[PDB]
Ligand binder design. Sequence first.
Ligand SMILES: Cc1cc2cn(-c3cccc(C(=O)N/N=C/c4ccco4)c3)cc2cc1C
Length: 153
Amino acid sequence: APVEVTYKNMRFLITHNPTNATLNKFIEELKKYGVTTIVRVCEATYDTTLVEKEGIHVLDWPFDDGAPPSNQIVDDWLSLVKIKFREEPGCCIAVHCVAGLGRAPVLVALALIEGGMKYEDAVQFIRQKRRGAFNSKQLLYLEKYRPKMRLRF
Ligand SMILES: Cc1cc2cn(-c3cccc(C(=O)N/N=C/c4ccco4)c3)cc2cc1C
């Protein structure tokens, strides 16, 4: 389920998980939204060689099962956001697991919070665009989440 999220000057795309045989359609869906980077939060699957060749960099930072992202992944994710939108204004960052496990959306949620949103509003903003956005462990994480590096001053 391709779902797009725009807040301030940030844009994110929560995609499905393609297979090697459907990568050409996937790449053109990404380009459609001007996606220039992809973060895989679940065990690797399709081969990235082809995607990269098309100008889309793939980042593999899996969570351990449905557990909240590690501090290392949260740090790198927030850094990616900060650098990508500052070096490529207007671009889009894609993130995905399998379009239903409620893992990928947390990353978008965290970006919204650091961007100024209340975790409550960040969750409703996403939940309204798609179901199964956050598993139980995920929601609790966001509830107790305190900003580590705000986006835009
Ligand atoms: C309650 C609620 C309020 C929302 C307000 N916007 C929204 C939409 C479009 C633009 C901006 C915005 O501030 N521009 N950024 C500017 C900027 C300058 C530098 C960096 O960024 C904000 C999405 C929302 C979603 C919800 C759910």
